[PDB]
Amino acid sequence: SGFRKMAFPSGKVEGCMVQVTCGTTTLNGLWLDDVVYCPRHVICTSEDMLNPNYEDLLIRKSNHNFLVQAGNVQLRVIGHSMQNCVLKLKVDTANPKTPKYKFVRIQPGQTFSVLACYNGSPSGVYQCAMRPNFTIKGSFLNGSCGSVGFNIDYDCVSFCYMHHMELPTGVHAGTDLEGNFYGPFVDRQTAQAAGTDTTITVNVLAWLYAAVINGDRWFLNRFTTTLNDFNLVAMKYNYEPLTQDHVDILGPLSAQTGIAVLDMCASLKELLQNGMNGRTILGSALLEDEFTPFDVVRQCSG
Amino acid sequence: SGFRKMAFPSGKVEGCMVQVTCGTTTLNGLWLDDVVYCPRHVICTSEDMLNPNYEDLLIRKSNHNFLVQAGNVQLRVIGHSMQNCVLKLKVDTANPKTPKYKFVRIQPGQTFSVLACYNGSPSGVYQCAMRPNFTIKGSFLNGSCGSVGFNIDYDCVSFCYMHHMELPTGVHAGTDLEGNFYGPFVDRQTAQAAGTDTTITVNVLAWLYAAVINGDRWFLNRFTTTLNDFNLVAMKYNYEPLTQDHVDILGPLSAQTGIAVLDMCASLKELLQNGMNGRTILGSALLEDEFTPFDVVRQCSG
Numbered sequence: 001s002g003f004r005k006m007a008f009p010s011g012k013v014e015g016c017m018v019q020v021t022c023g024t025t026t027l028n029g030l031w032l033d034d035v036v037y038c039p040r041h042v043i044c045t046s047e048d049m050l051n052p053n054y055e056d057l058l059i060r061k062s063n064h065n066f067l068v069q070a071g072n073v074q075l076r077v078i079g080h081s082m083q084n085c086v087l088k089l090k091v092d093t094a095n096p097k098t099p100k101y102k103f104v105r106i107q108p109g110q111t112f113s114v115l116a117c118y119n120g121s122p123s124g125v126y127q128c129a130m131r132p133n134f135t136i137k138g139s140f141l142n143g144s145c146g147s148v149g150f151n152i153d154y155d156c157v158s159f160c161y162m163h164h165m166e167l168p169t170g171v172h173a174g175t176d177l178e179g180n181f182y183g184p185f186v187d188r189q190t191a192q193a194a195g196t197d198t199t200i201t202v203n204v205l206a207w208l209y210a211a212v213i214n215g216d217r218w219f220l221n222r223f224t225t226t227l228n229d230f231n232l233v234a235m236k237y238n239y240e241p242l243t244q245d246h247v248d249i250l251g252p253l254s255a256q257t258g259i260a261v262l263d264m265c266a267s268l269k270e271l272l273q274n275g276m277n278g279r280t281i282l283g284s285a286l287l288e289d290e291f292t293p294f295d296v297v298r299q300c301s302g
Numbered sequence: 303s304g305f306r307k308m309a310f311p312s313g314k315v316e317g318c319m320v321q322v323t324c325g326t327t328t329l330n331g332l333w334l335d336d337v338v339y340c341p342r343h344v345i346c347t348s349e350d351m352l353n354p355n356y357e358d359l360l361i362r363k364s365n366h367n368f369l370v371q372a373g374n375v376q377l378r379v380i381g382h383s384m385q386n387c388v389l390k391l392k393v394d395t396a397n398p399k400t401p402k403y404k405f406v407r408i409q410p411g412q413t414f415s416v417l418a419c420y421n422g423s424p425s426g427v428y429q430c431a432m433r434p435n436f437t438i439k440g441s442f443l444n445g446s447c448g449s450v451g452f453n454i455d456y457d458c459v460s461f462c463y464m465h466h467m468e469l470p471t472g473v474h475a476g477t478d479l480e481g482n483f484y485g486p487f488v489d490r491q492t493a494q495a496a497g498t499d500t501t502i503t504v505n506v507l508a509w510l511y512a513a514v515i516n517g518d519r520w521f522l523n524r525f526t527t528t529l530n531d532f533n534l535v536a537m538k539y540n541y542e543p544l545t546q547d548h549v550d551i552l553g554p555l556s557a558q559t560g561i562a563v564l565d566m567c568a569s570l571k572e573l574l575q576n577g578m579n580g581r582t583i584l585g586s587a588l589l590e591d592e593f594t595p596f597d598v599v600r601q602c603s604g
């Protein structure tokens with residue numbers, strides 16, 4: 001019993017974290033096989049971040065300018081390239097701790113774990129979610145850049161995120177491991193703003209299902225609703241619109257609990273219209289949206 | 303910027319998790335040097351857990367009855383003993399992945415990370431706190447028993463918790479790595495109840511300091527208070543009494559923010575008497591008490 005915001009074990013990723021230093025800037029990199037991946041703004045000074053021409057700034061750099069340190073050993077850069085907003089440093093040694101891995105571009109609403117690093121050294125791990133506006137609400141300080149987000153299915157690590165920037169609002173923006181930013185953001189120190197951050201409705205419903213499984217049932221009402229009717233309430237409260245795909249994904253949870261999906265939608269509707277009246281669900285006074293339906297099943301079964 | 307409930311990287315502990323099987327029961331063990339540590343109720347059936355005589359049940363067991371499997375390799379038990387409520391299986395091979403480690407008995411109010419396992423396989427990591435009533439609010443399902451809680455300072459892993467039981471109320475109780483239970487609990491399937499669970503006042507104050515550091519300042523009032531006066535409010539709301547030691551520990555945070563401790567106590571007093579009025583602090587509608595003063599400093603500095 002009990003429900004916590006659990007992150008995947010981070011060991012397989014700890015063994016891939018390195019320190020990349022270009023000039024005076026040191027950030028974290030990801031060493032997989034014979035390639036180190038890092039944010040390309042490692043090649044930028046302070047003046048550069050205003051409006052950097054990354055192509056021109058890379059022309060002034062050679063292999064020996066990129067200092068890659070794994071633990072206390074130094075790595076020999078035999079090649080370097082730029083893929084979108086990520087720099088790929090080819091080293092002469094394959095990482096002996098490379099796990100089975102793939103690069104994945106996740107969708108808004110999906111969850112993943114973050115290993116937050118500083119100078120190629122792990123500091124902590126936490127579970128977060130890609131917000132619908134393609135931002136992440138994490139904990140990143142200077143030097144964190146190059147910190148990676150990942151999932152693990154069996155022995156396969158799916159890297160999906162690399163931290164790049166902290167927006168002026170305090171949220172965070174990054175790329176997939178191919179250097180493509182999530183959202184409209186660019187790796188420049190300019191005026192960038194996220195859109196409306198909506199609540200991931202399907203995740204809230206999964207979390208309400210977890211609550212029922214764990215004993216918290218007070219929110220369960222005597223009513224039901226329709227998908228169109230519920231989506232009307234969702235818009236007024238800036239909730240993601242619920243599709244039939246979303247309903248289909250919660251099937252396994254609806255089966256385990258004996259609670260229809262539209263029945264749970266009617267309980268959530270009441271919670272948005274009336275609030276919690278000071279009560280708590282799973283030790284939280286807000287509706288939590290950073291647990292996917294797959295996360296609830298995986299935690300309740302493990 | 304940003305504040306998350308961060309757990310220590312779990313890699314050093316992942317390499318120590320093994321699967322112990324005695325009879326039909328399989329739970330997790332901790333392999334350090336040439337000793338495997340596991341809950342002693344591994345030697346118990348279902349009838350036994352009612353009122354087990356662990357000494358008599360161990361007399362019926364020999365070294366070859368304890369099956370210890372690390373990954374896909376089997377370990378040779380050359381000795382076995384019982385220390386309080388933990389079983390120490392001496393194996394013939396030292397764990398090559400043993401980190402620098404020590405056994406620590408933490409105090410109520412302290413935090414630690416938990417690597418939740420099942421059959422010696424990691425499933426997830428999360429950050430929790432020893433409640434003042436010596437329980438922990440985690441996520442443990444059958445087979446989780448033997449899951450360990452730890453801290454990491456530099457390269458030193460301080461193991462402080464091993465999961466043993468889930469109480470009828472849904473909270474969890476366990477031991478230090480010397481087999482001594484936290485709290486009055488016993489490893490029997492009997493009627494055991496935790497006392498009043500109070501809120502860790504010093505941790506809430508640390509969290510309010512983190513909020514200020516991150517921009518959330520609305521709770522900051524124009525008032526102050528005294529230690530005796532505040533403790534009066536703490537008792538009415540089942541908050542831990544605040545000592546001068548607690549005030550001294552928050553010194554570094556009071557220095558960084560320029561907010562006196564008794565000034566922050568007066569803001570918390572208002573929050574307990576009036577509530578949040580629907581507002582949120584660091585994305586939470588409740589007062590969070592699972593961040594120690596040392597945790598806030600470590601996260602804001604890392």
Ligand SMILES: *S[C@@H]1O[C@@H](CO)[C@H](O)[C@@H](O)[C@@H]1O
Nearest residue numbers: 100101102153154155156157
């Ligand atoms: S990580 C991903 O899947 C694994 C199997 O789970 C394969 O071994 C890898 O080659 C692949 O990238």
Ligand SMILES: *S[C@@H]1O[C@@H](CO)[C@H](O)[C@@H](O)[C@@H]1O
Nearest residue numbers: 402403404455456457458459
């Ligand atoms: S883990 C603890 O401290 C370390 C140093 O940080 C020592 O090396 C260990 O022997 C000790 O148990």
Ligand SMILES: [Cl-]
Nearest residue numbers: 285286587588
């Ligand atoms: Cl909350």
